[PDB]
Design a protein around this ligand. Structure first.
Ligand SMILES: CN/C(C)=C1\C(=O)Nc2ccc(S(=O)(=O)N(CC(C)C)C[C@@H](O)[C@H](Cc3ccccc3)NC(=O)O[C@H]3CO[C@H]4OCC[C@H]43)cc21
Lengths: 99, 99
């Protein structure tokens, strides 16, 4: 679908058998999710934002279904204030900017 | 134009008679620019991000030309690590997400 930007672009995602809402965020290289229950191994990472840096858990090859479109990729987990779908997954569901 | 998301969506903007590069960022409600030389009055504000909060200067009704499309709106100025065009201006140049 086409999405205009008068409101936050939020979509429902299914990850880890859970349902969540997340922002399609072109300003985010990588997908970062709020603290959540996710199976398996992870690596320690930090990412930076407006405001400074957070420590996250990096999970690779994680399946995420984003408004019904499946994608597999890296998902970062930690104290973000909002669940964010970043460009690593946006390119996989064919998402583009248009003006 | 259509913009795919394999790379950061950067565009050249003209603001304040200066040329800058900025990220089209659907995850940003408001446009925030790195420290820059801008004429006139401003109000003190804080905005929050991944990582915590920054203090910015809020300038209203600022003209910005974004990949050749003019927009007037609020522009926040302060210690962001990247110049960001947020949805307050993205809606004005007709920018949409598509998947
Ligand atoms: C090395 N890689 C980097 C830097 C990132 C990554 O890999 N995944 C990321 C996911 C998110 C972020 S970010 O949140 O820090 N971010 C970078 C932006 C500053 C260039 C994305 C940006 O869209 C954030 C998303 C956000 C929304 C709500 C709360 C916190 C973060 N936008 C943002 O900071 O917006 C400011 C500007 O206007 C307001 O809208 C809501 C927050 C306010 C960075 C990264």
């Amino acid at each position: 679908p086409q999405i205009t930007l008068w409101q936050r672009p939020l979509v429902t995602i299914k990850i880890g058998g859970q349902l969540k809402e997340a922002l399609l965020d072109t300003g985010a290289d990588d997908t970062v999710l709020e603290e959540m229950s996710l199976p398996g191994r992870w690596k320690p990472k930090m990412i930076g934002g407006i405001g400074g840096f957070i420590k996250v858990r990096q999970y690779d090859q994680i399946l995420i279904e984003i408004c019904g479109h499946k994608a597999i990729g890296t998902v970062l987990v930690g104290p973000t204030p909002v669940n964010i779908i970043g460009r690593n997954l946006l390119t996989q569901i064919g998402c583009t900017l248009n003006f």
